[PDB]
């Protein structure tokens, strides 16, 4: 091991978990891109 895996614990919660909110956050964000995408197209085409 539990002690092995502490600081790892902590470590992977810290950095790894914040892998949640990075690709969340980066993928989440990434709907703003796709929704002007369709907009200028819609406007465009229509």
Known sequence: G?????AV?????DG???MK?????IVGALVILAVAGLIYS???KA
């Open 2 to 6: 539990v002690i092995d895996t502490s």
């Open 9 to 13: 614990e902590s470590a992977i919660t």
């Open 16 to 18: 790894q978990g914040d």
């Open 21 to 25: 909110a990075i690709g969340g956050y």
């Open 42 to 44: 819609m406007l465009r």
